[PDB]
Design a protein around this ligand. Structure first.
Ligand code: ADP
Ligand code: ADP
Lengths: 531, 531
């Protein structure tokens, strides 16, 4: 059989739901090669794995080929771009002929932007003789012995749009940035020949690596292995001997080796939108039980009974507006909305779409909307709605899709009642708003319990006895209160010559009181305009 | 053996920390060629030295090859750009085949922008046949006998972004402009065959050459050697004989020869962002002991106990805002903030980002933020925040990275309390500001002592007896007072026919009192709004 060093299904732990989607796409054509000759159903030829580079997209194709048992030729895009004019088309044709020779098989096109850009972009004519004959060999769809052309690209709007037409590249699956649990899985994978000691736990290590692709996670565990082996075998002065197995197994990576490898800069994945299914429940956001009661009607009630809600002749609401004071848990309530729906989270920000405004990147607005269309089920939180009217126009003209079966919930948060234009206020598009108020006693106490449970908590406080003077201290304001209280705890605790109730109670008798008291009536006139 | 005229490790003195980083990267692949065949760890193939030209990036690769004992091939980018179509790709392929022939070895690609630009930028199609096959021979990663491909470029956003993807060019180290201590080291290097006399001290020479690369420092010591040898050997009328080595050692470069060579123009490094580790202590900035107490909590307390501050579940604050009167040591307090943190200093200015605003160079804003990500540990002082809202948007959308392990401290200084927008003032991003006040009695006395110690000081003054009338005279204002007092010391001291207490005391009885007295309450109402 094949060697175990080849990649298997177990070796990938980035996005296993997308792995299941790829298996659901291509497993039946590949494991069952004759069934499509009997049925009159076209198999999906040409799925397209789009995502950031280094997400392991070659390993997906190699793993599904090696588990399935299909032959795996690889057309690297930069490999056939450097052959001379006419030789590159000839090599592409021989690659597809070799694919059709030992079929069933799968052939990969890594870095299709090197073959096909979105614009023509290249005023020489040998590029169009390369994307042409690739469009022709996309029409290997004769319901043959099955070949599936998996492809890779940096962005799905970076390829030529003639590829996205039907019959050429039909399915378009996002491999996606891995989540924190996927980071735990991939660090658990990347230890089998590294042979860590028991001190390294990798949980907080994976949690500290948010915003990075699987490639530089493999590079950071490799770098930690380099730091662990760099303390020895030259200091031991035994390079002259053979490479000793008991020395390597006696060596182990250490916790501060991982801290060292993380400490050097690894921004191989530039910062982008996030894909995550949160575990943050209703209770972790403080109070808001009437807001819970409305939002259960808004998202939990349609997904508990989609058949009964659709049977009553009305679609579910497209999304709620969060309207009220800024930073009062309204930003983190979308975690509970996604969690109790068991849906994914997208948290694209206001200044991000402002950068799309200033760079005229409304194509990126369309791309993140279609990204939300791809994620299923998911929620589309977006704060700072009053910051933008090109982006308001683009949001309104792209929200017209009616993917209520996708259960996308278009939730937006802003503080300005009517400075934001009433083009959103038209009924049927996005109008079932709610007034999120200032955090009250239960809200402040429960958000203090949640944000103080995650810290070392020597409380010794009745939280009503602490938060009674908070007339309108917001959740952002009270987490800043906890921030400066724990900073004074740092101030009195780290001073030494070489407990925490004191800092809560000096925050209780503190002289810094800053509450936006005048804005509750500013919300209340428009709330009474609702009446 | 190899000749001593070849470059060694001791020859380079520009950025020895980056030299240590390069050694940490490529020493174990090169000094230990067999160890990666047994371990399952990919060595970093293709580190990338980026910096201004003439920083010595060829000498780094030649030095690590010559000290390590690996073969050094050099693919000069302009050299293989001039061959005919298909011949250049053939030469690149034979160069990589020769690299794989006598491996372990290192190959260099100087001026990769001549090979690969950031845009496609060239509507001929032989350039993409040149950057392609370079991407293909980046995939010499078979964990072979190890070859590492060092690369050189002017700017890290000037190469093609397909090179920055993982597996092709992984490590991206800044070779960096040298500091003043590096200038001392490189002028100490450039004297071994020059044979200076004892009058030349080179310390003030190195201090006078801020803003210049190592190339024109070698050119200025060469020019000083030319000035020293240009007074003789034709004036002596002894060119006809053999070149006398005893006369050459009897010849010596002189102090005014260095002044002459510096006096002719050497702008080979155009003015850019600066990289420096200051030694300017807390005492060198006048007073501000309560601001010292806050800033010790802000930067010194996290770096004294990172484990205890992270163990309390709260990240360190991203950076304080200097809020108060302009030019009162707020520009130079970041020197102390970097100094007792033992961190690097970046002092990018407000009008510099205004030139990024007017030229729409937000890519340069991303590049200087990633430069701060590269520098470790460092601080990111940036004044004139009220000058800028595209750049405010870009700063906010790029400051969202959470490199608290890097100990980057996002400090900004401005005088306008609320004219600058509070989008930065949203909590958790950049909110723990402080009110830097006008310099008081201790502050003005200490800044006068520090700025007058560096001058020839015949003080004979009680500094309280001088600065009692300074109601609100700033540190910029009082250094201007010292400036005009020393200019009157010039006025009375150099007049002659062919001491300094008089000028301090006529500054004491001077008739120019210009203090912005009206703005202390303008700061004080917002400071009491903090309450
Ligand atoms: N989801 C994942 N599971 C396992 N390994 C991964 C994953 N993502 C990235 N990697 C690691 O990152 C590297 C990048 O994957 P590769 O497919 O070679 O590059 P690219 O994705 O750019 O084609 C691989 O060597 C792999 O070990
Ligand atoms: N850090 C340094 N140490 C020693 N010499 C240097 C340093 N930086 C620059 N130089 C001098 O400057 C010149 C520029 O170096 P070189 O690598 O030849 O040019 P480039 O960096 O443009 O490829 C060299 O001749 C070298 O002598």
């Amino acid at each position: 059989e094949e060697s175990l060093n080849e990649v298997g299904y177990d070796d990938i732990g980035g996005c296993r739901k997308q792995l299941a989607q790829i298996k659901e796409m291509v497993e039946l054509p590949l494991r069952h090669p004759a069934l499509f000759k009997a049925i009159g159903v076209k198999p999906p030829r040409g799925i397209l794995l789009y995502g950031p580079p280094g997400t392991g997209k070659t390993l997906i194709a190699r793993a599904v080929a090696n588990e399935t048992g299909a032959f795996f030729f690889l057309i690297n895009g930069p490999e056939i771009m450097s052959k001379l004019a006419g030789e590159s088309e000839s090599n592409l044709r021989k690659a597809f002929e070799e694919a059709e020779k030992n079929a069933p098989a799968i052939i990969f096109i890594d870095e299709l932007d090197a073959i096909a850009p979105k614009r023509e972009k290249t005023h020489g004519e040998v590029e169009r003789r390369i994307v042409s004959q690739l469009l022709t060999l996309m029409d290997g769809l004769k319901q043959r012995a099955h070949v599936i052309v998996m492809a890779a690209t940096n962005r799905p709007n970076s390829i030529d749009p003639a590829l996205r037409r039907f019959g050429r590249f039909d399915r378009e699956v996002d491999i996606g940035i891995p989540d924190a649990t996927g980071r735990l899985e991939i660090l658990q994978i990347h230890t089998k020949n590294m042979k860590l000691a028991d001190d390294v736990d990798l949980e907080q290590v994976a949690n500290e690596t948010h915003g990075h692709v699987g490639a530089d996670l493999a590079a950071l565990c490799s770098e930690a292995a380099l730091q662990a082996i760099r303390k020895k075998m030259d200091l031991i002065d035994l390079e002259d001997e053979t490479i000793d197995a008991e020395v390597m197994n006696s060596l182990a990576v250490t916790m501060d080796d991982f801290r060292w490898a993380l400490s050097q800069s690894n921004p191989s994945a530039p910062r982008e939108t996030v894909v995550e299914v949160p575990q943050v429940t209703w209770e972790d956001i403080g109070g808001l039980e009437d807001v819970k009661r409305e939002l259960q009607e808004l998202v939990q009630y349609p997904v508990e009974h989609p058949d009964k809600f659709l049977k009553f002749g009305m679609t579910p609401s497209k999304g709620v507006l969060f309207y009220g004071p800024p930073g009062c848990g309204k930003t983190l309530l979308a975690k509970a909305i996604a969690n109790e729906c068991q849906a994914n989270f997208i948290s694209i920000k206001g200044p991000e779409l402002l950068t799309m405004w200033f760079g005229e990147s409304e194509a990126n607005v369309r791309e993140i909307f279609d990204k939300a269309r791809q994620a299923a089920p998911c929620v589309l939180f977006f704060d700072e709605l009053d910051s933008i009217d090109r982006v308001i126009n683009q949001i309104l003209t792209e929200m017209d899709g009616m993917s209520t079966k996708k259960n996308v919930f278009i939730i937006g948060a802003t503080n300005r009642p009517d400075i934001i234009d009433p083009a959103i206020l038209r009924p049927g598009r996005l109008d079932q708003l709610i007034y999120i108020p200032l955090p009250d006693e239960k809200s402040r106490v429960a958000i203090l319990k949640a944000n103080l449970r995650k810290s070392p908590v020597a409380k010794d406080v009745d939280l009503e006895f602490l938060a009674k003077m908070t007339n309108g201290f917001s959740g952002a304001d009270l987490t800043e209160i906890c921030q400066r209280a724990c900073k004074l705890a740092i101030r009195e605790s780290i001073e030494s010559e070489i407990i925490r109730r004191d800092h809560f109670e000096e925050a209780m008798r503190f002289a810094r009181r800053s509450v936006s008291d005048n804005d509750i009536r500013k919300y209340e006139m428009f709330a009474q305009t609702l009446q």
